[PDB]
Amino acid sequence: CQFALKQPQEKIVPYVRQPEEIIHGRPLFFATAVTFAGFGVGLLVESHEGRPTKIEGNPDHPASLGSTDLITQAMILTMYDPDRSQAPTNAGQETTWDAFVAAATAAMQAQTAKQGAGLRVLSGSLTSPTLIAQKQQLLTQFPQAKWYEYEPVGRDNANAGARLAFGADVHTIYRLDTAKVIVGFDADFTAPSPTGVRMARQLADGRRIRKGTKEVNRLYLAESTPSITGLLADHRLPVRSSQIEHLVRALATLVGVPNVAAGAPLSDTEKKWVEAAAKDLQANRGACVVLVGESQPPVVHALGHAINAQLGNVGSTVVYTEPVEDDPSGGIAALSALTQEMNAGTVEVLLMIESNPVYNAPADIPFAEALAKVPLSMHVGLYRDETAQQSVWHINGAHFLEAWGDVRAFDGTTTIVQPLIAPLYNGKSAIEVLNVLLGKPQETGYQTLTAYWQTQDASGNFRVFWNTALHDGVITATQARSRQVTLQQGFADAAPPAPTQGLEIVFRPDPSLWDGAFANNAWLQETPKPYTKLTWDNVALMSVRTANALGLKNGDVVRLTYQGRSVDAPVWVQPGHADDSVTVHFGFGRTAAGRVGNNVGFNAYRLRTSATPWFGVGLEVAKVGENYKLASTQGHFLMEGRKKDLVRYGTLAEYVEDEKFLQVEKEEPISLIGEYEYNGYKWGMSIDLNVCNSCNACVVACQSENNIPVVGKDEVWLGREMHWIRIDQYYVGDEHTPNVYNMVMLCQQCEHAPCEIVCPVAATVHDAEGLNNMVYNRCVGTKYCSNNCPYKVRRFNFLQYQDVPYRSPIDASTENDSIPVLKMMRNPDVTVRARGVMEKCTFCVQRINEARIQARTENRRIADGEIMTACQQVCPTQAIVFGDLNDPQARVVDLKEQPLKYTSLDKLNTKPRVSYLAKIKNLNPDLAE
Amino acid sequence: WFKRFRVSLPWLFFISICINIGMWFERWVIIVLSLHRDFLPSSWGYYTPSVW
Ligand code: HEC
Ligand code: SF4
Ligand code: SF4
Ligand code: SF4
Ligand code: F3S
């Protein structure tokens, strides 16, 4: 309880030399990009003065068409993490940066005496052309130096399948805008992948269902575990993850592949799925695609290129370009070829660009014991990772908002990573650390970036070319050239072995925490996982029929014993799952993540075996626990007959006969309160629930925009998560093969808002614009608004929820004292809320007002695209559409007169401003029985 | 209804002590059981009270 008669003397400081570009109070968006796996996502990040506070999508970029992922959006709390490495560290104790360049250059003259032998580098799968040119300068200065590229969710099997079918390595850019059916095969392509935002928009562009739409996408999936593409899949099949090599061998023989050598037969529901998915592939040959993700072996990846070359997709929707990444034939096998080189000496310098392989290595690859045999182990990462303690040297990371850099996206388009801010802690990025190893330690990150692009610009007037590349983000004088391929024959001749009986393990990246590189990010942790709405826990995902054979409920801790290792995993049962196919997720069990990701789940990387790195069948469950915490944030995953109010679901077979078949043509409701007249800037929202894949990028972008506090695991289990927007799975149907439906439930901004009439101090009123104003400074904390809110989209600050993964919220010793580096990530237009006030989705009223007030100074009206909320500017599928309702030529006034426009809880006369477009899941005639 | 359990104070005390515990439970059923499960299934809570 802070208390004073006056607020203290607030100092206002100007600059000392104010730069020309900065106007105090204006957002000043900068066009950068983020190296996610090795590829760029393409960003438009908002730097108010120097500090970037909100990552948005670069609409010029090919990967993100103006909308980012869940992980890509929450790179701001990773930037302003107080657990970031604030100083370099030599053998445990802190040090300077120039002590490193006196120790590294003293070890670089000892390597030139040899042929640069012990100079192994362990970067992760980089595509950026400046670090490729610095590597190719490093590997021509030191001849016998090796560059190994380890990535745990790398495209190892995806490139080994491109070698096994085409000869050389080829990059495969799929194109779903000309695609009628998308027969995936263990391919979560709408996930946080290097192309996950474009493959989600192109998949959702095909199924924008309007007044005159008769043909949409189909999306046969056959997924191991329920993955977020399965929300958009209309024929998702729970396959055991070991039969997907045999579903493709049953589908490559229905289409024309001569040497498929099919084996290991199918079940009666996997065979009638594959005789109908391939029947819809033999038709519409020009617009169809067979997808396969890196969970699969390299043979089926080669068969996925065999089917796509049989159906004539090459040149139409599956283009083949030169490989954008530098070393495509190096993955887990490149990490295993390094530790067998790291053993018994014969390595002297080991640079480790941000990989964290002490934590990420498979159990068959002894990277822990092979490390500390290197006399000089250097590590470059923005966290003191699991490796940085076990490394001799350690450098800061220079997170991409702090560092001058490049990155190449898929399609080959290079985008320059400008620093929006100077390095808070002197970061010294990967382009600046190789400058020390090459011999140019005083050369900055900008001096070696323009030194490369001056030589890769064959046009004159480089300053026009360079300033345009920083402005637009993209370059597009550098796209990957389309490669003519062969599709060699005789690659799947060897018959597969017997399908081994036994309970299967399935390795996955968590959609929140991909490979544990961002496990210290608080926004990604408390963001609910897509199907199983959990926050701070790795789980073992079982089917309802698998757990019934083993006899374990939704909270027991089991000791998953793989080939030699046990992991002591909790259990979350899951209806969409495959039989005997227990799924564990990466990204957890970090022992040196920081204060957010330390000991949150079980480390699934201790079960990888580097020969079965994604799935294996030798698992023993052996329950050893009971009643784990498992802080979930949904309460009931089962639509309880509340259809017509949550997710109205239909098929396209019944929509082509009746347009408004999910609407209820009912009489106008009677209200005794009358109504009000909204005549200027009527704000409404249309959420297309048919295209929402539950990517949770809108949950974490409301968090980054509206200063929403993270809440720890102990207070999520009490149902006190602060999330203004939530996605609701609902699991309609059979408990073994259900349909999972998303309802993006935010504050519906009800016109006859029942949450407002129950506010004693009137801390919740309306605009004349029409949206619901939750004023935080007036809230005395009587949680009656939350009780009368029928959707329960009100979210109360219970404790002082502020910097909660860095100080536990059950104290008042640091209640009114805040972390100084976390204050820069906050939006300066949203109230950072106190201990006892309630929150609510305010339609991003700080984005409404900042363009309503700006349109009043220049005497005009707001257009449609001038106001774009944070959940709308992030949705890769563009499910959310915000806009004026009194503007007749608007985009939301079209989407709210569609025959699928329904409002949630119209049984109550709340009259919401948020209407939902209903879900239509395009069932085949040969499979709907 | 019966005077047997009204004039007898060891019986009127047990009846009245079952109303103070019971009418607490009426106001628990009214408040919690209407709040902890409501319109939307994705907002179903439990409210096990803490020591405070
Ligand atoms: C000292 C606290 C104070 C605050 C905070 C304040 N005003 Fe205003 N304010 C106006 C006028 C006139 C407008 C323009 C109304 C419009 O354009 O719709 C306005 C508009 C605004 C707007 C912009 C509304 C929009 O549509 O963006 C804001 C914000 C605002 N006032 C805040 C006269 C005043 C005056 C009269 C001398 C006073 C004092 C005044 N305002 C004091 C204050
Ligand atoms: S939807 Fe809920 S929070 Fe929003 S105005 Fe209506 S009652 Fe209030
Ligand atoms: S529109 Fe509302 S719910 Fe959506 S991101 Fe903005 S504040 Fe959150
Ligand atoms: S509304 Fe958009 S951002 Fe949110 S879950 Fe759906 S697709 Fe993802
Ligand atoms: S009713 Fe009123 S004062 Fe605060 S929490 Fe609810 S708003």
Side-chain angles (χ1 to χ4, degrees):
Chain A
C1 304
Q2 199 168 24
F3 272 102
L5 289 173
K6 282 187 56 178
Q7 38 194 335
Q9 182 52 238
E10 313 188 25
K11 305 266 178 63
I12 285 297
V13 298
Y15 283 93
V16 302
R17 287 162 210 86
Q18 180 179 275
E20 159 204 351
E21 281 296 301
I22 289 177
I23 309 173
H24 288 291
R26 305 294 271 153
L28 203 60
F29 307 94
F30 276 88
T32 177
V34 50
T35 301
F36 170 66
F39 295 94
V41 192
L43 293 195
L44 206 58
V45 189
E46 177 193 65
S47 88
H48 281 86
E49 291 87 8
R51 43 186 183 89
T53 74
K54 173 70 169 51
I55 283 183
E56 311 151 345
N58 197 349
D60 308 327
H61 196 72
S64 82
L65 280 81
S67 52
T68 59
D69 279 322
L70 156 65
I71 308 183
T72 300
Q73 189 71 28
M75 305 284 286
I76 292 289
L77 197 147
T78 291
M79 156 74 200
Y80 291 115
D81 218 358
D83 306 345
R84 268 193 43 172
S85 67
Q86 313 199 3
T89 290
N90 171 40
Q93 73 271 330
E94 293 199 3
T95 181
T96 83
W97 153 258
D98 308 280
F100 163 73
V101 309
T105 49
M108 284 310 113
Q109 307 311 312
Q111 281 303 309
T112 42
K114 317 204 291 176
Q115 287 95 50
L119 191 37
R120 313 278 178 268
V121 185
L122 203 40
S123 62
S125 160
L126 62 95
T127 68
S128 89
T130 314
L131 203 39
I132 284 170
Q134 275 199 350
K135 159 185 68 75
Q136 288 156 341
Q137 269 181 342
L138 182 83
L139 301 184
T140 196
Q141 171 193 6
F142 307 95
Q144 296 176 20
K146 317 194 79 190
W147 191 287
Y148 289 112
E149 278 189 345
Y150 172 60
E151 199 64 276
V153 195
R155 299 147 297 275
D156 314 321
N157 298 148
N159 296 339
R163 253 177 290 113
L164 199 145
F166 292 118
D169 295 283
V170 66
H171 189 216
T172 306
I173 302 156
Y174 300 110
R175 191 205 199 190
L176 314 185
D177 80 313
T178 77
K180 302 301 192 53
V181 308
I182 304 163
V183 186
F185 277 114
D186 208 349
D188 194 12
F189 55 92
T190 47
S193 74
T195 178
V197 276
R198 198 195 178 86
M199 296 264 273
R201 193 160 289 191
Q202 289 176 327
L203 159 63
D205 278 332
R207 57 179 72 182
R208 297 269 195 264
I209 289 176
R210 303 291 160 248
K211 285 176 193 158
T213 42
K214 303 290 172 51
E215 305 203 49
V216 296
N217 289 19
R218 198 94 62 167
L219 193 45
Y220 305 91
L221 208 69
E223 47 176 358
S224 159
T225 182
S227 55
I228 79 168
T229 313
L231 284 316
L232 289 201
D234 308 310
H235 296 288
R236 50 159 318 271
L237 185 64
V239 188
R240 274 193 79 251
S241 185
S242 44
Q243 290 293 119
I244 303 169
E245 201 186 20
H246 317 126
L247 266 71
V248 182
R249 264 154 175 163
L251 191 142
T253 177
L254 293 185
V255 312
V257 182
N259 292 67
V260 51
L266 285 78
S267 81
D268 49 306
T269 176
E270 306 174 10
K271 204 178 58 57
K272 87 178 178 183
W273 176 93
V274 76
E275 294 151 17
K279 197 171 295 298
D280 216 331
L281 279 172
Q282 293 162 4
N284 46 75
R285 288 183 69 248
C288 76
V289 63
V290 176
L291 298 187
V292 51
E294 213 264 313
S295 157
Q296 288 305 126
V299 176
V300 44
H301 269 112
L303 278 153
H305 297 157
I307 301 154
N308 284 334
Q310 170 56 232
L311 304 165
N313 306 327
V314 295
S316 290
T317 176
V318 179
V319 300
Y320 281 123
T321 59
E322 280 204 331
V324 191
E325 53 185 17
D326 44 4
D327 213 350
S329 46
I332 301 153
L335 179 75
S336 190
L338 181 50
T339 71
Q340 71 201 16
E341 187 85 69
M342 271 158 63
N343 290 310
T346 186
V347 57
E348 309 184 349
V349 192
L350 180 55
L351 175 64
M352 263 165 299
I353 318 184
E354 173 51 273
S355 197
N356 198 22
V358 165
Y359 161 76
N360 275 333
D364 274 0
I365 305 181
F367 192 79
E369 290 272 65
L371 205 50
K373 279 197 171 71
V374 198
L376 190 89
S377 298
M378 321 171 310
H379 179 244
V380 178
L382 55 93
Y383 289 134
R384 289 191 167 94
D385 293 299
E386 276 76 35
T387 303
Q389 286 109 21
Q390 273 76 9
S391 279
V392 163
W393 275 93
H394 171 244
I395 315 298
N396 311 107
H399 182 272
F400 72 97
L401 309 165
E402 296 183 311
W404 264 114
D406 296 347
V407 66
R408 272 185 81 179
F410 85 113
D411 306 74
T413 290
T414 317
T415 159
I416 318 291
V417 185
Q418 314 170 50
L420 282 83
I421 198 173
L424 305 177
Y425 321 106
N426 278 14
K428 308 291 170 287
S429 64
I431 316 175
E432 313 195 14
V433 177
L434 271 77
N435 284 340
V436 184
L437 301 192
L438 198 151
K440 318 164 300 187
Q442 312 288 329
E443 189 157 334
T444 43
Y446 177 74
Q447 270 203 4
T448 183
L449 207 81
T450 56
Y452 170 73
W453 284 106
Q454 269 154 352
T455 65
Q456 286 306 116
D457 169 40
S459 172
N461 198 355
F462 165 73
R463 172 210 77 258
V464 163
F465 158 73
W466 181 247
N467 280 76
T468 313
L470 309 172
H471 181 270
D472 292 330
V474 290
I475 290 188
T476 51
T478 175
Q479 281 198 341
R481 306 171 291 266
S482 190
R483 163 179 296 272
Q484 184 73 211
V485 301
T486 304
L487 197 86
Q488 74 198 19
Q489 282 300 318
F491 57 90
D493 313 335
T500 300
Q501 300 84 50
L503 188 135
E504 193 155 333
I505 205 174
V506 165
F507 296 108
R508 288 292 147 172
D510 199 344
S512 303
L513 324 171
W514 195 242
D515 51 351
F518 321 104
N520 206 1
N521 184 274
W523 284 339
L524 290 184
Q525 294 266 10
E526 204 202 357
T527 294
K529 320 299 176 193
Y531 277 85
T532 78
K533 296 292 179 183
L534 294 144
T535 52
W536 297 76
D537 278 324
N538 211 336
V539 281
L541 293 190
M542 302 185 183
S543 186
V544 189
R545 208 170 48 238
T546 293
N548 267 345
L550 300 172
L552 43 85
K553 66 180 76 173
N554 223 319
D556 311 300
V557 197
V558 303
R559 197 187 285 163
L560 295 177
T561 316
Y562 200 46
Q563 298 179 352
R565 316 290 193 288
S566 314
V567 79
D568 211 341
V571 157
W572 191 271
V573 306
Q574 190 192 25
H577 211 89
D579 48 310
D580 307 72
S581 161
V582 181
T583 286
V584 298
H585 295 275
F586 303 145
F588 292 86
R590 291 199 61 188
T591 178
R595 281 173 291 185
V596 187
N598 272 343
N599 318 319
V600 286
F602 59 96
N603 188 6
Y605 285 107
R606 74 172 52 199
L607 302 171
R608 313 269 305 278
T609 44
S610 75
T612 56
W614 288 100
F615 65 100
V617 308
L619 196 59
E620 298 141 308
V621 169
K623 162 168 141 53
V624 295
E626 189 95 3
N627 281 117
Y628 201 70
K629 184 61 68 69
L630 283 199
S632 180
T633 169
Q634 171 93 339
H636 212 58
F637 290 87
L638 202 64
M639 189 182 293
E640 209 71 25
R642 281 96 165 98
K643 199 218 169 287
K644 320 315 295 194
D645 286 310
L646 315 173
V647 179
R648 305 188 182 181
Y649 52 94
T651 81
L652 203 73
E654 51 200 83
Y655 168 66
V656 293
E657 57 202 59
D658 211 340
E659 286 277 346
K660 51 179 69 65
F661 78 108
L662 278 170
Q663 275 187 15
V664 191
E665 188 56 81
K666 64 186 188 297
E667 185 49 38
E668 200 78 12
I670 307 181
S671 52
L672 313 175
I673 66 166
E675 74 183 24
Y676 273 102
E677 192 68 1
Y678 303 104
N679 276 346
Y681 299 138
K682 192 168 160 161
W683 297 116
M685 183 190 271
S686 177
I687 305 182
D688 188 311
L689 292 180
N690 177 40
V691 301
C692 182
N693 63 334
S694 180
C695 66
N696 267 327
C698 56
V699 162
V700 82
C702 200
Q703 209 149 29
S704 67
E705 177 67 28
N706 297 291
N707 309 342
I708 313 181
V710 184
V711 156
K713 179 186 159 45
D714 286 6
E715 311 270 319
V716 165
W717 186 79
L718 310 158
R720 318 166 159 180
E721 66 278 350
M722 318 298 301
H723 276 325
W724 291 14
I725 172 174
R726 58 162 195 259
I727 290 95
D728 301 332
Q729 321 302 108
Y730 273 126
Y731 286 105
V732 176
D734 177 68
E735 50 206 59
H736 317 299
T737 307
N739 297 334
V740 193
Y741 294 121
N742 311 313
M743 185 185 38
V744 194
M745 181 40 74
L746 50 89
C747 169
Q748 319 271 299
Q749 314 280 320
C750 319
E751 281 191 39
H752 315 322
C755 51
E756 295 190 349
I757 83 170
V758 289
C759 203
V761 295
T764 323
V765 296
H766 275 95
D767 277 327
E769 270 60 61
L771 69 150
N772 195 284
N773 304 133
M774 180 49 220
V775 49
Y776 308 109
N777 52 66
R778 180 51 166 195
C779 197
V780 310
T782 133
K783 316 113 304 177
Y784 190 2
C785 34
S786 180
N787 300 5
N788 203 12
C789 192
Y791 317 90
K792 304 276 167 290
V793 282
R794 284 308 267 262
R795 289 302 194 255
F796 194 48
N797 276 257
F798 284 99
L799 308 169
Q800 179 56 262
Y801 291 144
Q802 180 161 278
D803 311 333
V804 175
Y806 311 100
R807 56 98 188 170
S808 76
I810 53 173
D811 54 3
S813 289
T814 176
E815 180 144 281
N816 47 4
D817 206 299
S818 48
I819 314 294
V821 78
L822 277 171
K823 296 169 70 163
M824 324 177 55
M825 86 176 180
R826 261 68 166 261
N827 219 26
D829 309 307
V830 190
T831 320
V832 190
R833 285 145 301 258
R835 164 148 57 83
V837 309
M838 197 159 276
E839 314 188 348
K840 188 197 66 74
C841 165
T842 53
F843 269 174
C844 304
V845 76
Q846 77 278 349
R847 284 164 166 243
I848 292 171
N849 295 336
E850 74 180 5
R852 176 174 55 90
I853 293 157
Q854 202 208 334
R856 292 282 292 149
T857 65
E858 60 199 7
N859 289 316
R860 64 179 183 92
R861 284 261 307 201
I862 314 167
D864 194 275
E866 203 74 64
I867 302 194
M868 186 167 266
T869 65
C871 44
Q872 183 196 358
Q873 221 178 338
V874 77
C875 189
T877 55
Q878 280 302 318
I880 306 178
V881 173
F882 177 85
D884 206 343
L885 274 176
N886 280 335
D887 198 359
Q889 312 294 326
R891 275 179 59 237
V892 72
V893 304
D894 295 28
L895 260 69
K896 284 165 89 94
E897 63 165 344
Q898 300 297 142
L900 285 311
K901 177 249 178 174
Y902 84 98
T903 56
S904 193
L905 294 177
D906 52 357
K907 177 152 299 312
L908 271 52
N909 205 21
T910 53
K911 265 185 76 62
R913 285 295 173 83
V914 172
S915 89
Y916 297 91
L917 282 174
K919 180 136 185 72
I920 293 97
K921 46 153 197 285
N922 202 21
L923 290 188
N924 221 38
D926 315 327
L927 285 157
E929 177 79 27
Chain B
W1 290 107
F2 325 108
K3 183 193 180 52
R4 181 177 281 167
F5 315 104
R6 272 190 281 107
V7 64
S8 46
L9 306 184
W11 262 118
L12 190 44
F13 201 91
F14 175 68
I15 280 178
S16 90
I17 208 166
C18 287
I19 295 161
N20 290 75
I21 295 153
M23 289 296 304
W24 191 93
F25 274 140
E26 177 196 289
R27 297 177 174 95
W28 162 273
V29 164
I30 285 158
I31 293 173
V32 168
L33 276 77
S34 308
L35 270 166
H36 91 99
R37 278 186 176 183
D38 56 296
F39 308 97
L40 259 56
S42 63
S43 54
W44 283 8
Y46 273 111
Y47 189 57
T48 295
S50 68
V51 289
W52 316 104

